[PDB]
């Protein structure tokens, strides 16, 4: 019964990676270790490691001191500013600015605010909206590829595996048309720069899309020319 | 870690005072000196019935010559350095919008704006940004918000934020990014950064020639660009000097040190150099930093400072080089230089230095009510008009903001009261005071109404009036004494004692000498004054004589050339049906290669459930449409988008929900397994499940009508958008549009073929036209495969219909709310109908009978076990497609070679009769029985089988099987009663009645016939009296008796009434079976 366990493993892995990637904030990942200013009313410079993570629905900005306790305070921050149709970015930025959290986090949050010169908000609010809708479409197709394989219509259960594998690479494109503009915008942090490159979720979606596109095709060709 | 041993000053302004982190910030709100003076009390501005007309007030008092010299010899570099400084502090010019205008109304026959006496002409004017948390009750009226850092912190050189101070920096040392020329900044940062207004003299609105400064609009005059370039080059100079004296320093260290030095020099110059010259009295002194003073910009400061600086701008500005040869007539006119992109003279650093050395020697105009014509008549128009009165827009802004009057705002500052009009300016009325009379006549001799611009300008003799002077002075003292990063603050740790004593000895001559590399003896010690001993005198006072005239007016026409293209695009959209019609036509040609009351009563009797269903469906759709349209028209809607597009937006937003619902449930209609299960339940007695295709076509037609309405509404919308300014469009669809002053909206074809909704809407129109024309009655009878090939577009349709709402243009997507349940059910039923398979019956024999019926008989597959009264659905592929049509079997189960009786009633049936004509070769695709096979007449001693109309189809099988089983096995006296109108198509049924009568010798089945058709018949060669029937039935034999009935609603209702009226006293179950 090895082949049955293999089929169950493949189906469950594909479903799990679709679900996890649609809700993961790791599509674009940058990281750097800079020397920045901690916060207002103090002339003291700190040593921290700063990095942002963009996930189709908002950004995570993490400020963590290399010594977590270096200025009598513990430095471990992880703030989230979301721009999806449900929420608003400017109100979140205003509340964060009224709170008083450290300056580099406020800066990296400002880079994505609406009407900023860099214009990084309206191409992340729509690309991350379409690449999160073409990943809810590649789920209803995976469910149908799970059903049509249970009650054998495999001749038609090998096309849902060309639709799921295509609707993933049709969403790995909307989030591919954004690094074209995030590259010119500067992200200088004190004496260091910040390079944001494609992260785990992107490569995982690429691998899963390729796997489904190939598996559906091979199984369809086989069960067509040889229903063994 | 480095040499930045201080707290770097933020760009936005926050966190400057410890207690209140918000006082001087990017979007703070202006703090009034006097309670708001709106019309209603909250946000309504005073207007023309109450206060005189702005364009008629400007003409009467603020109009005159342009050759008057200043009384204190203030050089025009002072005027424009003031224009520069007062853009570091306050900016209330950008219109924040839920788009709301208050226009200027020109009088009749204005020689400049209404030259041909065209009745009344309107100058547009828009309200500015307001604080969203104010303007809702007379306790807190609306307050505006300035969009620049309200400190004197060089918020005009380095921008007022941090993402802004990056887009104009090079990170190559501490330096602001220059262009190919080291002297000028980089024009290459033009979009998304600066203000682009079309040069009103030519019309060019391109991003070439728009430099990158820290003030969004510093390119408004070459004379303001001159000071912008001066400060830019000074920053670069001091920074490169720092680099050549501290080589190992980074980029940030150089930038921050040069920035703090430039900011300190700027503050020193501005305060202690410009104020003692603007109003001729020195700021008092510097006490300790006061952490409690309120440094909030007031609107009266805006009025005083800027709308008084506008009183002394000259007509033309001179130009001279180091030895002052005033050529580079050469005095470039002002009214032709607004927003100049590339000026043929100011194309090199030497020319900018010449412009500065010429401004620093030209005595600006005098300080009184008279304003030159280069601002009064020829100020660049904000929208649609290319020209605009300045002083008639400054009054509209003073009444836009809640500015006080001149007598109300003269007693809230401790100043004495004025008696009458002659006492406003006592020295003015001593010589030609016929302007105070002209302005009293305008105000109906009512002194307590002066809008505080004509009241302030009328009191200023040689200096600003006693009213403007106190406002400017105390505002600047509050700016300096409430600032933590003030260069004279010894607590902030920015500069030492000698670095403060060195910054406090810097004049504007030192900066000009350092930047322009000019000998210090070619200028004057105080650049803001020319005092009869300073070098390089003026040639002659510059009157507006001998200067090039001002470029005349022209109205701007959006939607001017692209009207024919718009009409052609609409005509092409409308001729989508014609292209599909032609394609299907060539496809066909290629494939060929007192009594009326009773009539209405019978009709309403038959068609009750159909009327109920149609009424409920159309009620629901109309309710959705009415909800949306009512919510939009006059209801709880933020009236941002609904100004003149009420009709279009109402139409579109009302039809959208209705068509989404109609499409989702027209998908629901075509699911046949659920219908096959449901039509054998009590639901059928309330809704008819045999009219699903008619309901389908009805829904389709209604949906196409509503879709045409939707598309027409959106076409009207797209037209009304292509003529709206950018300032209006930029707050209907925020995020999609941005308001740089270019003001030209996107063309129609941008909305149509370059947006997701428009493009997918055109695609959906094409797909709908194809699918609707190929599905016509006169185009599916010809080719069943044409019909079958196009209709698979509905998946493409339901893909597009998700992309059509995938945007935040008007509202949130709601189609996916409607589409879930019907699509889930339909996909489930498709999987159910696609799992089971049965195919390939062989037709044994098929004779052709009259009246249309075609007796068909095919072999019985081995596994085929079925009951009496079950139908099968068959398809012949020889002619057309694999279209499954249902037919009730007419053979007893004990008999092999299952039979059928098919009645010619349309395309498929006539084609099938043509196929099996000439008596049987083709083979069908029988799809098994579909029924419950209710055999409940075994539980009743005596049954009464009643069939009417079309419902007499399975009774042949029923009776044959019943007599066979009664004979073989060895249900008492079952009776069959069938009432028909014409007895036309059912003659084979009479043959079967005869064959059953002949077979039965035990006298079980007794048939009875009622033909019920009078006076209209062919003689064919009464009524079914159920009332005495049951009375005699129980009498003749003492049997519970079943009276199962199948037929039209009239007959079954009649037999129901009969059996119920006669039941009350056996059982008489009356179990109406729909086969
Ligand atoms: C993307 O970001 C979101 C939002 O942060 C993440 O979701 C949150 O996940 C955390 C982790 O479990 C949940 O728990 C919260 O975390 C709090 C973190 O506290 C730090 O930050 C505080 C402000 O945010 C800060 O006050 C504090 O230090 C400061 O104050 C101290 C005094 O209290 C002072 O001594 C220090 O020197 C310093 O000045 C902390 O450093 C934690 O405190 C709480 O337990 C809290 O529950 C959150 O609930 C989650 N968010 C929500 C809205 O529920 C998300 O995981 C991120 N994405 C990924 C992929 O990780
Ligand atoms: C002996 C006999 C038994 C029949 N038994 C049944 C039955 O048990 N159940 C049943 O639903 N129909 C039954 N029908 C109707 C028969 O299916 C239609 O005449 C035929 O399927 C379609 O006719 P057409 O396509 O040639 O003409 P069309 O012009 O396509 O016929 C138009 C009419 O037929 C109806 N119709 C079309 N397709 C279907 C379909 N797939 N299902 C139902 N109605 C349709 C439409 O509502 C429309 O009013 C029976 C017909 C005959 C002659
Ligand atoms: C007037 C236009 C239309 C007509 C005349 C029409 C007619 C029909 C007919 C006759 C059928 C199938 C009949 C059969 O089963 O033999 C059909 C099937 C269908 N039509 Fe339409 N239809 C029309 C418009 C639409 C529209 C707009 C839709 C859009 C959703 C649509 C969706 C369907 C669907 C979903 C089927 C299902 C067929 C199947 O898969 O079994 N139809 N239509
Ligand atoms: C000129 C062609 C059309 C234009 C310009 C157009 C434009 C629009 C726009 C702007 C919306 C709302 C935008 C959004 O928020 O997503 C909309 C919604 C919609 N349009 Fe169109 N449309 C057009 C044609 C059609 C056609 C032919 C259909 C028929 C299906 C159609 C069906 C819809 C539907 C169902 C919505 C529902 C919106 C929703 O999802 O709630 N439109 N259309
Ligand atoms: C960061 O600061 C530490 C503090 O000692 C210093 O040693 C280090 O060189 C600095 N590095 C950078 C990249 O600024
Ligand atoms: C200034 O302009 C005069 C005009 O002829 C010219 O002769 C002179 O060379 C210019 N430059 C100076 C004086 O430095
Ligand atoms: C300092 O005093 C005055 C103030 O402007 C100035 O005239 C003088 O030249 C300055 N002394 C210098 C710069 O050595
Ligand atoms: C102002 O400039 C004119 C220009 O020649 C000069 O005659 C006059 O004396 C100057 N004013 C004073 C007070 O010196």
PDB file of C-alpha atoms in Angstrom, chain B residues 703-921:
ATOM      1  CA  UNK B 703     -29.822  39.674 -17.129  1.00  0.00           C
ATOM      2  CA  UNK B 704     -28.745  40.848 -20.584  1.00  0.00           C
ATOM      3  CA  UNK B 705     -31.143  43.794 -20.333  1.00  0.00           C
ATOM      4  CA  UNK B 706     -29.759  44.804 -16.937  1.00  0.00           C
ATOM      5  CA  UNK B 707     -26.207  44.308 -18.232  1.00  0.00           C
ATOM      6  CA  UNK B 708     -26.857  46.686 -21.130  1.00  0.00           C
ATOM      7  CA  UNK B 709     -28.130  49.227 -18.597  1.00  0.00           C
ATOM      8  CA  UNK B 710     -24.986  48.704 -16.487  1.00  0.00           C
ATOM      9  CA  UNK B 711     -22.672  49.238 -19.459  1.00  0.00           C
ATOM     10  CA  UNK B 712     -24.524  52.371 -20.579  1.00  0.00           C
ATOM     11  CA  UNK B 713     -24.290  53.839 -17.086  1.00  0.00           C
ATOM     12  CA  UNK B 714     -20.571  53.120 -16.948  1.00  0.00           C
ATOM     13  CA  UNK B 715     -20.081  54.712 -20.372  1.00  0.00           C
ATOM     14  CA  UNK B 716     -21.758  57.887 -19.108  1.00  0.00           C
ATOM     15  CA  UNK B 717     -19.488  57.689 -16.052  1.00  0.00           C
ATOM     16  CA  UNK B 718     -16.315  57.230 -18.125  1.00  0.00           C
ATOM     17  CA  UNK B 719     -17.320  60.303 -20.119  1.00  0.00           C
ATOM     18  CA  UNK B 720     -17.942  62.403 -17.009  1.00  0.00           C
ATOM     19  CA  UNK B 721     -14.531  61.329 -15.703  1.00  0.00           C
ATOM     20  CA  UNK B 722     -12.584  62.419 -18.795  1.00  0.00           C
ATOM     21  CA  UNK B 723     -13.649  66.053 -18.225  1.00  0.00           C
ATOM     22  CA  UNK B 724     -13.012  66.254 -14.466  1.00  0.00           C
ATOM     23  CA  UNK B 725      -9.833  67.910 -13.154  1.00  0.00           C
ATOM     24  CA  UNK B 726      -7.115  65.863 -11.505  1.00  0.00           C
ATOM     25  CA  UNK B 727      -7.873  67.497  -8.151  1.00  0.00           C
ATOM     26  CA  UNK B 728     -11.384  66.029  -8.252  1.00  0.00           C
ATOM     27  CA  UNK B 729     -10.392  62.608  -9.592  1.00  0.00           C
ATOM     28  CA  UNK B 730      -7.588  62.309  -7.030  1.00  0.00           C
ATOM     29  CA  UNK B 731     -10.096  61.968  -4.172  1.00  0.00           C
ATOM     30  CA  UNK B 732     -12.783  59.913  -5.874  1.00  0.00           C
ATOM     31  CA  UNK B 733     -10.284  57.101  -6.499  1.00  0.00           C
ATOM     32  CA  UNK B 734      -7.442  57.831  -4.051  1.00  0.00           C
ATOM     33  CA  UNK B 735      -4.309  55.758  -4.416  1.00  0.00           C
ATOM     34  CA  UNK B 736      -5.076  55.387  -8.114  1.00  0.00           C
ATOM     35  CA  UNK B 737      -4.613  59.122  -8.776  1.00  0.00           C
ATOM     36  CA  UNK B 738      -2.257  61.728  -7.323  1.00  0.00           C
ATOM     37  CA  UNK B 739      -2.643  65.505  -7.384  1.00  0.00           C
ATOM     38  CA  UNK B 740       0.366  67.134  -8.895  1.00  0.00           C
ATOM     39  CA  UNK B 741      -0.876  70.297 -10.528  1.00  0.00           C
ATOM     40  CA  UNK B 742      -0.737  68.939 -14.081  1.00  0.00           C
ATOM     41  CA  UNK B 743      -4.584  68.854 -13.762  1.00  0.00           C
ATOM     42  CA  UNK B 744      -5.084  66.890 -16.982  1.00  0.00           C
ATOM     43  CA  UNK B 745      -7.134  63.718 -16.475  1.00  0.00           C
ATOM     44  CA  UNK B 746      -6.597  60.405 -18.213  1.00  0.00           C
ATOM     45  CA  UNK B 747      -8.232  59.905 -21.600  1.00  0.00           C
ATOM     46  CA  UNK B 748     -11.267  57.693 -22.193  1.00  0.00           C
ATOM     47  CA  UNK B 749      -9.275  54.828 -23.705  1.00  0.00           C
ATOM     48  CA  UNK B 750      -7.245  54.692 -20.496  1.00  0.00           C
ATOM     49  CA  UNK B 751     -10.441  53.940 -18.584  1.00  0.00           C
ATOM     50  CA  UNK B 752     -11.631  51.501 -21.240  1.00  0.00           C
ATOM     51  CA  UNK B 753      -8.615  49.494 -22.425  1.00  0.00           C
ATOM     52  CA  UNK B 754      -6.035  50.170 -19.683  1.00  0.00           C
ATOM     53  CA  UNK B 755      -7.988  49.420 -16.488  1.00  0.00           C
ATOM     54  CA  UNK B 756      -8.973  46.007 -15.142  1.00  0.00           C
ATOM     55  CA  UNK B 757     -12.734  46.769 -14.872  1.00  0.00           C
ATOM     56  CA  UNK B 758     -12.932  48.410 -18.303  1.00  0.00           C
ATOM     57  CA  UNK B 759     -10.877  45.786 -20.130  1.00  0.00           C
ATOM     58  CA  UNK B 760     -12.669  42.846 -18.526  1.00  0.00           C
ATOM     59  CA  UNK B 761     -15.997  44.595 -19.144  1.00  0.00           C
ATOM     60  CA  UNK B 762     -15.296  44.849 -22.858  1.00  0.00           C
ATOM     61  CA  UNK B 763     -14.210  41.199 -22.819  1.00  0.00           C
ATOM     62  CA  UNK B 764     -17.417  40.229 -21.004  1.00  0.00           C
ATOM     63  CA  UNK B 765     -19.500  42.207 -23.494  1.00  0.00           C
ATOM     64  CA  UNK B 766     -17.875  40.289 -26.348  1.00  0.00           C
ATOM     65  CA  UNK B 767     -18.325  36.913 -24.636  1.00  0.00           C
ATOM     66  CA  UNK B 768     -21.956  37.680 -23.774  1.00  0.00           C
ATOM     67  CA  UNK B 769     -22.695  38.737 -27.350  1.00  0.00           C
ATOM     68  CA  UNK B 770     -21.161  35.529 -28.721  1.00  0.00           C
ATOM     69  CA  UNK B 771     -22.869  33.241 -26.199  1.00  0.00           C
ATOM     70  CA  UNK B 772     -26.253  34.950 -26.596  1.00  0.00           C
ATOM     71  CA  UNK B 773     -26.301  35.090 -30.399  1.00  0.00           C
ATOM     72  CA  UNK B 774     -25.039  31.531 -30.877  1.00  0.00           C
ATOM     73  CA  UNK B 775     -27.740  30.349 -28.452  1.00  0.00           C
ATOM     74  CA  UNK B 776     -30.638  31.934 -30.315  1.00  0.00           C
ATOM     75  CA  UNK B 777     -33.671  29.871 -31.271  1.00  0.00           C
ATOM     76  CA  UNK B 778     -32.874  30.394 -34.958  1.00  0.00           C
ATOM     77  CA  UNK B 779     -29.171  29.506 -34.563  1.00  0.00           C
ATOM     78  CA  UNK B 780     -29.278  26.404 -32.337  1.00  0.00           C
ATOM     79  CA  UNK B 781     -31.835  24.569 -34.476  1.00  0.00           C
ATOM     80  CA  UNK B 782     -29.301  24.557 -37.324  1.00  0.00           C
ATOM     81  CA  UNK B 783     -26.153  23.376 -35.517  1.00  0.00           C
ATOM     82  CA  UNK B 784     -26.273  21.731 -32.098  1.00  0.00           C
ATOM     83  CA  UNK B 785     -22.470  21.654 -32.014  1.00  0.00           C
ATOM     84  CA  UNK B 786     -22.174  25.392 -32.599  1.00  0.00           C
ATOM     85  CA  UNK B 787     -24.540  25.975 -29.681  1.00  0.00           C
ATOM     86  CA  UNK B 788     -22.515  23.440 -27.695  1.00  0.00           C
ATOM     87  CA  UNK B 789     -19.086  24.930 -28.439  1.00  0.00           C
ATOM     88  CA  UNK B 790     -19.804  28.515 -27.392  1.00  0.00           C
ATOM     89  CA  UNK B 791     -21.762  27.839 -24.205  1.00  0.00           C
ATOM     90  CA  UNK B 792     -18.604  26.621 -22.486  1.00  0.00           C
ATOM     91  CA  UNK B 793     -17.695  30.311 -22.219  1.00  0.00           C
ATOM     92  CA  UNK B 794     -19.652  30.518 -18.956  1.00  0.00           C
ATOM     93  CA  UNK B 795     -16.513  29.404 -17.115  1.00  0.00           C
ATOM     94  CA  UNK B 796     -14.574  32.170 -18.871  1.00  0.00           C
ATOM     95  CA  UNK B 797     -17.503  34.411 -17.922  1.00  0.00           C
ATOM     96  CA  UNK B 798     -17.315  33.443 -14.244  1.00  0.00           C
ATOM     97  CA  UNK B 799     -13.562  34.012 -14.298  1.00  0.00           C
ATOM     98  CA  UNK B 800     -13.934  37.510 -15.757  1.00  0.00           C
ATOM     99  CA  UNK B 801     -16.763  38.307 -13.327  1.00  0.00           C
ATOM    100  CA  UNK B 802     -14.339  37.902 -10.456  1.00  0.00           C
ATOM    101  CA  UNK B 803     -11.644  39.986 -12.048  1.00  0.00           C
ATOM    102  CA  UNK B 804     -14.272  42.720 -12.830  1.00  0.00           C
ATOM    103  CA  UNK B 805     -14.738  43.333  -9.119  1.00  0.00           C
ATOM    104  CA  UNK B 806     -11.065  42.769  -8.141  1.00  0.00           C
ATOM    105  CA  UNK B 807     -10.327  46.534  -7.310  1.00  0.00           C
ATOM    106  CA  UNK B 808     -11.330  49.149  -4.741  1.00  0.00           C
ATOM    107  CA  UNK B 809     -12.631  51.750  -7.204  1.00  0.00           C
ATOM    108  CA  UNK B 810     -16.169  52.228  -5.880  1.00  0.00           C
ATOM    109  CA  UNK B 811     -16.891  49.474  -3.352  1.00  0.00           C
ATOM    110  CA  UNK B 812     -15.779  46.070  -2.114  1.00  0.00           C
ATOM    111  CA  UNK B 813     -16.227  42.876  -4.162  1.00  0.00           C
ATOM    112  CA  UNK B 814     -19.492  41.082  -3.433  1.00  0.00           C
ATOM    113  CA  UNK B 815     -19.858  38.663  -6.364  1.00  0.00           C
ATOM    114  CA  UNK B 816     -17.982  35.927  -4.499  1.00  0.00           C
ATOM    115  CA  UNK B 817     -20.664  36.190  -1.802  1.00  0.00           C
ATOM    116  CA  UNK B 818     -23.436  35.312  -4.264  1.00  0.00           C
ATOM    117  CA  UNK B 819     -21.428  32.816  -6.286  1.00  0.00           C
ATOM    118  CA  UNK B 820     -20.465  30.329  -3.563  1.00  0.00           C
ATOM    119  CA  UNK B 821     -23.574  28.231  -2.846  1.00  0.00           C
ATOM    120  CA  UNK B 822     -24.949  27.926  -6.424  1.00  0.00           C
ATOM    121  CA  UNK B 823     -21.523  27.034  -7.821  1.00  0.00           C
ATOM    122  CA  UNK B 824     -20.888  24.500  -5.044  1.00  0.00           C
ATOM    123  CA  UNK B 825     -24.244  22.808  -5.675  1.00  0.00           C
ATOM    124  CA  UNK B 826     -23.787  22.882  -9.452  1.00  0.00           C
ATOM    125  CA  UNK B 827     -20.284  21.388  -9.275  1.00  0.00           C
ATOM    126  CA  UNK B 828     -21.522  18.667  -6.934  1.00  0.00           C
ATOM    127  CA  UNK B 829     -24.350  17.811  -9.318  1.00  0.00           C
ATOM    128  CA  UNK B 830     -21.962  17.835 -12.278  1.00  0.00           C
ATOM    129  CA  UNK B 831     -19.742  15.352 -10.440  1.00  0.00           C
ATOM    130  CA  UNK B 832     -22.776  13.193  -9.638  1.00  0.00           C
ATOM    131  CA  UNK B 833     -23.900  13.184 -13.282  1.00  0.00           C
ATOM    132  CA  UNK B 834     -20.307  12.566 -14.421  1.00  0.00           C
ATOM    133  CA  UNK B 835     -19.550   9.619 -12.118  1.00  0.00           C
ATOM    134  CA  UNK B 836     -22.130   7.117 -13.394  1.00  0.00           C
ATOM    135  CA  UNK B 837     -21.901   5.926 -17.002  1.00  0.00           C
ATOM    136  CA  UNK B 838     -24.131   3.925 -19.343  1.00  0.00           C
ATOM    137  CA  UNK B 839     -23.926   3.893 -23.138  1.00  0.00           C
ATOM    138  CA  UNK B 840     -24.421   2.128 -26.464  1.00  0.00           C
ATOM    139  CA  UNK B 841     -27.883   0.678 -26.838  1.00  0.00           C
ATOM    140  CA  UNK B 842     -28.734  -0.878 -30.200  1.00  0.00           C
ATOM    141  CA  UNK B 843     -32.102  -0.030 -31.760  1.00  0.00           C
ATOM    142  CA  UNK B 844     -33.938  -3.250 -32.622  1.00  0.00           C
ATOM    143  CA  UNK B 845     -36.787  -1.600 -34.547  1.00  0.00           C
ATOM    144  CA  UNK B 846     -38.303   1.894 -34.793  1.00  0.00           C
ATOM    145  CA  UNK B 847     -41.492   2.308 -36.797  1.00  0.00           C
ATOM    146  CA  UNK B 848     -42.778   5.792 -37.606  1.00  0.00           C
ATOM    147  CA  UNK B 849     -46.291   6.558 -36.376  1.00  0.00           C
ATOM    148  CA  UNK B 850     -48.661   9.391 -37.324  1.00  0.00           C
ATOM    149  CA  UNK B 851     -49.412  12.529 -35.306  1.00  0.00           C
ATOM    150  CA  UNK B 852     -45.702  12.968 -34.625  1.00  0.00           C
ATOM    151  CA  UNK B 853     -44.949  10.087 -32.277  1.00  0.00           C
ATOM    152  CA  UNK B 854     -42.052   7.859 -33.353  1.00  0.00           C
ATOM    153  CA  UNK B 855     -42.218   4.459 -31.663  1.00  0.00           C
ATOM    154  CA  UNK B 856     -38.629   3.549 -30.795  1.00  0.00           C
ATOM    155  CA  UNK B 857     -37.500   0.141 -29.554  1.00  0.00           C
ATOM    156  CA  UNK B 858     -33.969  -0.855 -28.558  1.00  0.00           C
ATOM    157  CA  UNK B 859     -32.403  -3.884 -26.909  1.00  0.00           C
ATOM    158  CA  UNK B 860     -32.300  -4.204 -23.130  1.00  0.00           C
ATOM    159  CA  UNK B 861     -28.781  -4.254 -21.630  1.00  0.00           C
ATOM    160  CA  UNK B 862     -28.115  -7.124 -19.250  1.00  0.00           C
ATOM    161  CA  UNK B 863     -27.759  -5.204 -15.992  1.00  0.00           C
ATOM    162  CA  UNK B 864     -30.773  -2.996 -16.688  1.00  0.00           C
ATOM    163  CA  UNK B 865     -33.252  -3.628 -13.857  1.00  0.00           C
ATOM    164  CA  UNK B 866     -36.003  -1.002 -13.695  1.00  0.00           C
ATOM    165  CA  UNK B 867     -39.552  -0.537 -12.418  1.00  0.00           C
ATOM    166  CA  UNK B 868     -42.864   0.548 -13.927  1.00  0.00           C
ATOM    167  CA  UNK B 869     -42.942   4.303 -14.459  1.00  0.00           C
ATOM    168  CA  UNK B 870     -39.278   5.262 -14.804  1.00  0.00           C
ATOM    169  CA  UNK B 871     -37.794   7.457 -17.520  1.00  0.00           C
ATOM    170  CA  UNK B 872     -34.446   7.279 -19.314  1.00  0.00           C
ATOM    171  CA  UNK B 873     -32.514  10.031 -21.096  1.00  0.00           C
ATOM    172  CA  UNK B 874     -30.962   9.283 -24.495  1.00  0.00           C
ATOM    173  CA  UNK B 875     -28.728  11.082 -27.001  1.00  0.00           C
ATOM    174  CA  UNK B 876     -27.976  10.303 -30.654  1.00  0.00           C
ATOM    175  CA  UNK B 877     -24.557  11.496 -31.820  1.00  0.00           C
ATOM    176  CA  UNK B 878     -25.096  10.884 -35.542  1.00  0.00           C
ATOM    177  CA  UNK B 879     -26.959  14.210 -35.800  1.00  0.00           C
ATOM    178  CA  UNK B 880     -25.537  16.930 -33.578  1.00  0.00           C
ATOM    179  CA  UNK B 881     -24.051  16.546 -30.105  1.00  0.00           C
ATOM    180  CA  UNK B 882     -24.262  14.464 -26.909  1.00  0.00           C
ATOM    181  CA  UNK B 883     -27.372  16.199 -25.535  1.00  0.00           C
ATOM    182  CA  UNK B 884     -29.316  14.066 -23.050  1.00  0.00           C
ATOM    183  CA  UNK B 885     -33.088  14.433 -23.386  1.00  0.00           C
ATOM    184  CA  UNK B 886     -35.478  12.671 -20.979  1.00  0.00           C
ATOM    185  CA  UNK B 887     -38.203  10.282 -22.125  1.00  0.00           C
ATOM    186  CA  UNK B 888     -40.572   8.050 -20.161  1.00  0.00           C
ATOM    187  CA  UNK B 889     -40.398   4.341 -20.947  1.00  0.00           C
ATOM    188  CA  UNK B 890     -43.511   2.695 -22.374  1.00  0.00           C
ATOM    189  CA  UNK B 891     -42.637  -0.980 -21.885  1.00  0.00           C
ATOM    190  CA  UNK B 892     -43.412  -3.411 -19.100  1.00  0.00           C
ATOM    191  CA  UNK B 893     -40.371  -4.538 -17.070  1.00  0.00           C
ATOM    192  CA  UNK B 894     -41.003  -8.218 -17.851  1.00  0.00           C
ATOM    193  CA  UNK B 895     -40.635  -7.396 -21.565  1.00  0.00           C
ATOM    194  CA  UNK B 896     -37.292  -7.298 -23.324  1.00  0.00           C
ATOM    195  CA  UNK B 897     -36.388  -4.674 -25.927  1.00  0.00           C
ATOM    196  CA  UNK B 898     -37.258  -1.518 -23.961  1.00  0.00           C
ATOM    197  CA  UNK B 899     -39.503   0.877 -25.865  1.00  0.00           C
ATOM    198  CA  UNK B 900     -40.113   4.614 -26.200  1.00  0.00           C
ATOM    199  CA  UNK B 901     -42.695   6.963 -27.697  1.00  0.00           C
ATOM    200  CA  UNK B 902     -41.202  10.291 -28.745  1.00  0.00           C
ATOM    201  CA  UNK B 903     -43.285  13.300 -29.786  1.00  0.00           C
ATOM    202  CA  UNK B 904     -41.940  15.825 -32.291  1.00  0.00           C
ATOM    203  CA  UNK B 905     -41.666  19.076 -30.350  1.00  0.00           C
ATOM    204  CA  UNK B 906     -38.586  20.942 -31.608  1.00  0.00           C
ATOM    205  CA  UNK B 907     -35.058  20.792 -33.030  1.00  0.00           C
ATOM    206  CA  UNK B 908     -33.660  17.676 -31.360  1.00  0.00           C
ATOM    207  CA  UNK B 909     -36.829  15.622 -31.752  1.00  0.00           C
ATOM    208  CA  UNK B 910     -37.331  16.513 -35.418  1.00  0.00           C
ATOM    209  CA  UNK B 911     -33.673  15.719 -36.118  1.00  0.00           C
ATOM    210  CA  UNK B 912     -34.056  12.373 -34.337  1.00  0.00           C
ATOM    211  CA  UNK B 913     -37.186  11.566 -36.350  1.00  0.00           C
ATOM    212  CA  UNK B 914     -35.248  12.430 -39.515  1.00  0.00           C
ATOM    213  CA  UNK B 915     -32.385  10.165 -38.416  1.00  0.00           C
ATOM    214  CA  UNK B 916     -34.520   7.078 -37.734  1.00  0.00           C
ATOM    215  CA  UNK B 917     -36.780   7.730 -40.733  1.00  0.00           C
ATOM    216  CA  UNK B 918     -37.281   5.284 -43.622  1.00  0.00           C
ATOM    217  CA  UNK B 919     -37.661   1.961 -41.722  1.00  0.00           C
ATOM    218  CA  UNK B 920     -32.994   1.939 -37.064  1.00  0.00           C
ATOM    219  CA  UNK B 921     -29.240   1.746 -37.686  1.00  0.00           C
TER     220      UNK B 921
END
